[PDB]
Design an enzyme around this catalytic site. Sequence first.
Site, short mmCIF file in Angstrom:
data_model
loop_
_atom_site.label_atom_id
_atom_site.label_comp_id
_atom_site.label_asym_id
_atom_site.label_seq_id
_atom_site.Cartn_x
_atom_site.Cartn_y
_atom_site.Cartn_z
CD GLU A 222 -2.63 1.29 2.57
OE1 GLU A 222 -2.59 0.29 3.34
OE2 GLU A 222 -3.34 2.31 2.79
CG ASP B 66 -8.38 4.64 5.44
OD1 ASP B 66 -9.34 4.76 4.66
OD2 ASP B 66 -8.14 5.40 6.40
CG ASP C 14 -0.43 1.75 5.93
OD1 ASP C 14 0.44 1.18 5.23
OD2 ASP C 14 -0.69 2.95 5.90
CG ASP D 182 -3.97 2.52 8.26
OD1 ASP D 182 -4.45 1.88 7.30
OD2 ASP D 182 -3.03 3.38 8.05
MN LIG Z 1 -2.26 4.40 6.29
#
Ligand SMILES: [Mn+2]
Lengths: 189, 189, 481, 481
Positions: free
Chosen positions: A19, A96, A92, A94
């Site tokens: 990513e 997203d 990540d 996270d």
């Molecule tokens: Mn991120």
Amino acid sequence: KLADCSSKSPEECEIFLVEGDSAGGSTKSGRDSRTQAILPLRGKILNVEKARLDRILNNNEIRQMITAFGTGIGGDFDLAKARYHKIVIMTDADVDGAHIRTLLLTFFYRFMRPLIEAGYVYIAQPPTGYKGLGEMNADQLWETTMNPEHRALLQVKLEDAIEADQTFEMLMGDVVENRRQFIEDNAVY
Amino acid sequence: KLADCSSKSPEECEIFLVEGDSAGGSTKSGRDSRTQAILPLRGKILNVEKARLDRILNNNEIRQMITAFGTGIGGDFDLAKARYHKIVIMTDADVDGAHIRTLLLTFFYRFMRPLIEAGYVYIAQPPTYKGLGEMNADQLWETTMNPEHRALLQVKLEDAIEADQTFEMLMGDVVENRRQFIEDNAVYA
Amino acid sequence: NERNITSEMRESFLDYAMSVIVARALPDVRDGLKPVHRRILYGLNEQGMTPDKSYKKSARIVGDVMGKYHPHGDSSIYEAMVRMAQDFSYRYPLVDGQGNFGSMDGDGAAAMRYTEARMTKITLELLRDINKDTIDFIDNYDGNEREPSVLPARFPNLLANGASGIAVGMATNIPPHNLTELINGVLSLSKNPDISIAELMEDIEGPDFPTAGLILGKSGIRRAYETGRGSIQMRSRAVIEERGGGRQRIVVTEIPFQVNKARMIEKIAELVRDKKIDGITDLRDETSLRTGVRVVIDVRKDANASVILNNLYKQTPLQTSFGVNMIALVNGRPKLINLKEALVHYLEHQKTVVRRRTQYNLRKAKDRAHILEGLRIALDHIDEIISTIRESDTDKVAMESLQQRFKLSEKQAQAILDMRLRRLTGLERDKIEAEYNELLNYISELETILADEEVLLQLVRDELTEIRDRFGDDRRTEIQL
Amino acid sequence: NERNITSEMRESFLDYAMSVIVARALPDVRDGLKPVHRRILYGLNEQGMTPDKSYKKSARIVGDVMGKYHPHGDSSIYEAMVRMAQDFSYRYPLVDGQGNFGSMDGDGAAAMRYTEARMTKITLELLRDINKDTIDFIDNYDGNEREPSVLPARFPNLLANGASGIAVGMATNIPPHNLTELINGVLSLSKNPDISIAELMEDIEGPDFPTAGLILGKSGIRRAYETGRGSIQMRSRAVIEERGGGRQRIVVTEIPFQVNKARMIEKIAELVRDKKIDGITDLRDETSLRTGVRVVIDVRKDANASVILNNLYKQTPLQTSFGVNMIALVNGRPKLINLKEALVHYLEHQKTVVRRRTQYNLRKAKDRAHILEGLRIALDHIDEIISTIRESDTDKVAMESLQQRFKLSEKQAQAILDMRLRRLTGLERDKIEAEYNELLNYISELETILADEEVLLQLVRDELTEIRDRFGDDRRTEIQL
DNA sequence: GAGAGTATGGCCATACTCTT
DNA sequence: GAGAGTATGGCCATACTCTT
Ligand SMILES: [Mn+2]
Ligand SMILES: O=c1c2nccn2c2cc(F)c(-c3ccncc3)cc2n1C1CC1
Ligand SMILES: O=c1c2nccn2c2cc(F)c(-c3ccncc3)cc2n1C1CC1
Ligand SMILES: [Mn+2]
Ligand code: NA
């Protein structure tokens, strides 16, 4: 933007979907060039479930994945033509990065289902934390996430084909209400 | 990115050359759209004194200016075809703006000398540390855009032998002359 | 009214030319920095970004620098800062970088959104004693803030990290150097103002690049050090080794300074592809963080590998030349300087720094000794002091009485009035006396230094030698033949 | 081990949706803010960018918010800040911006480098009393700062500036409202908690868009205020007028909320071009700063112009609907709310804010009363106090002696030992006494409020009314029947 | 439908010297 | 050559949802 590995025997090979090209740049420095390859995906990739077919075809992002996997899409799929025996989704840790992952899994489950049965699809496990993949040095991406000796990859598996059909339709499907109900039922606030 | 006035009468029309697209992008809200056009410059402008014709013509920035003025260049240049009878150089009031100014004046003097001789070329002069940039569009219009308060300067050509030498000395590909000139004239205080 | 074109050209060019020359593209001979670099490091100090403190986000670092001192684009600042953090660009890195800060292959660093930074230990030595009125400060671009005109630079950073800049009408290209050698040079010079370049070259053998490699011959060196200008040939470090089956290979472990490695491999690839070079069967970049740089070339069986290697130096960036052009700002002007000049100006900077520092310390110390005296007086006569204050209706009135009754200065009186009651306890009175005695000895030592030029000079020698011992390291670049 | 794909999809998807729902796309019912907006406003506060201070470079603003509170890309942050600075987007702008911040043609604002920003005066009322412990702080993303969970929001900001946000499995669309009517509605609701949405609508007439325009009919407002979801028809303000020669034109001076003008004009031009509308001879955007929005559509001689107008309403964004869907975070989770729940949940927030602030004023008053009582004891017996201190060999002993001899708390003794010598002067003594007497009256005033919930309310009403008088303005949008 | 609005980087022009 | 280094901004892709 694919950065291919030195070897040409797919059994020992791994490819990493990264990513962002910050996470990616880092990964090209950090990896074992001999056995590891890096492909970064630049943006939120299309939801192949919701979208019309032709959009999937003109799309670049979808096209760079097809080219990399070396099989062909849907009906022309050759698991013996698979360029890599390990496909790693590295995003990540996270919310997203969770999203991008769901989208990538959706693409595989609708156009390259034979690979999930095969068992070459893996989800990398970066350190959890506030820090993303882009903010870490190349050699710490290696010690924690890419090194065969210390990394922990999770093999993606398909344990029920009608259940997964129903789930992919419900979560990534055109209807919003089914998705709202799943959230209402399962959300922990 | 060119903005053009409602009028097609080149006698009352003015075009502004701004350093900074959204330095001039402000102006548009502020500028009188009846008689005023805006041509933002992206960066440092090709130094035509150092470049051969194929490169000059090929350059995007130069092409836009030629197109906007509409007179053509060199032998095919036609004065009577000028779309604006005022061309204004609006730059930041700082050294990179000064440097840009010399680049433009070089382009005019070498490729559209007639325009200078007519008196169609002007140098805008905004507020006597903040250049075009962090400044309200209405404020930009008031200080130098409006005909009722602004102080533009008309570029005169006095001696063409002197200008030829000066342009060649300062913008030429021979570095030594330029260094020599700097040594002779630079004053440090 | 009107602006004669020839006038506009000559005036407008000089501003840019002088500004690029004195305020952008050339280093100061004293600290070796160009304004963007100096403002980054000063900003890292002012923010409080020292090696013992947290890595700080780049965006805030960059924004702070840009808003306060550098009125230019953020990319320029970030890129300048990134280079100071690369161990292959800076022989003695000035920035400690966390995150992806690049690599030899020329893949650039990450966005400033993903990287953090702080000073390295050695940069503390550039900013050492900055507050102690050692360097002149100047107003910044909008007048809101003060910035340093030059850093104290307690090691010879111009030569240590080198410089390269394109200006207008000139450029500069100064190679990096070994810090142990430079400091030994400065020491030798400080003992002999009439030292020759050849004599200096005993201490300073030549450049020392962060990327090691080899330099061919001392004759290019010798002209660069004697005159400011010279061509120096840098070689990659490469050997020939057996790979089995009677076959050989060329292994490169080091490459020339400022040479993109990935790009160099492409050029070797192209040469083969275009059949320009004969006898190469394979080309692999075996570089890894664990193994270091390793570039492998596979010679065809029964082909001469030494010949192939020589052609590669000849037709490739494997052997590259470094054009020395040592131009720096001297008294705010561009000047071409030889090796001795560069050290001479540097040594004069250090003297000025230490002198100015001793003077600040002496001034600072004396002021404290004066305030302590009033406290000593106040403590001895305390009872009267307290009633005097109590009798008074205002500080102004109270101040006046104290200057009358005890012959005190305004500063002494204000100090007494500002005193807290806890300073009245038994330990504090002894504590105050102890400190006062220390200052007197300290003042004596400071005054001794100032009186003797040689004493001051020796101190500089001493402080340079400590830096050498703590930061000086082994030479990386071999100077062959 | 391995991962069941179905399990992965459920957990990963739920992870995203929940974050988008609770920490990105939906406003909190209490302050009307989404996270990025709250962080921008808080960030402006902390930086000290009040309206009395000068404008700051947008890039610095954003770099600080991004590093400190919002670990996301700059465009999200900068663009959010820009929106809050546009009079056509925010009925009551929360951000004051210098430079090009956009227009109603959809042309974006300038890059961060070219714009300046600060709070507006009304934003000070969102941030008012934030420090006086009125709202709960939480750790930020990296553990390194604290940020507000919600702002005090001394004016009903969800309803007043509206919100629009696409989440996952739901979305939100709340129109803006007139502040005067909003607060009058809150006032009526405070005097009568069983008040009906109808009754509230005697104050709150309908939405009030920054762009003015017309709302057609009261029938879809009512549905939205009663159920939370409704359709509202918007019309441009347009007249028909003579232009000379027995010819006419349609003149549009207000367009519907969120309609892009430049687009709207291009849709008209395109309809003309493709012969899908008869009778238009010219089309001009005559809008200035001075004269407002002015779009002129010239009408073919002896053609009917009302009829043309009517068609333009059918075929172009000149008439447009607004789909009300009022979903907001209520106790941290998404909820569809009608006009009364919006106001109820706000008014309860204001009661909490004001109570918590009074309590904190109390606590730090009482705290300070305590310290002044100590200093007054000291001043009443200053000679003994000094003796007690001078007899002690260490601060700890002096502390314990002071507490023992004069019955002082540890805090009071510490305060006395910290007291400077200048506070013994007549004027400085009088100040300690004067602060104490005022502070007893303040403490008395605060306890009155907390003993009586109706007083505490009435204070909310008064403060709201003060805000309403200073910031409330005329209604712009006309509601036609 | 439509486009409202928070989220998810890279590419790439020029000036300027010198050189291998 | 074209690259060493500090200077002077546009343009793209996507996900997600709704007006009873
Ligand atoms: Mn991120
Ligand atoms: O962060 C952004 C962003 N902020 C403003 C515009 N964009 C983008 C625009 C864009 F057009 C793209 C993009 C373009 C083409 N293919 C993928 C992403 C990406 C943007 N990204 C990140 C994902 C990289
Ligand atoms: O400020 C920048 C900048 N920072 C980093 C890269 N660039 C640019 C890259 C660029 F490629 C261009 C550019 C692109 C196309 N035509 C001209 C300039 C401009 C940049 N600018 C603008 C000041 C000019
Ligand atoms: Mn500028
Ligand atoms: Na070579």
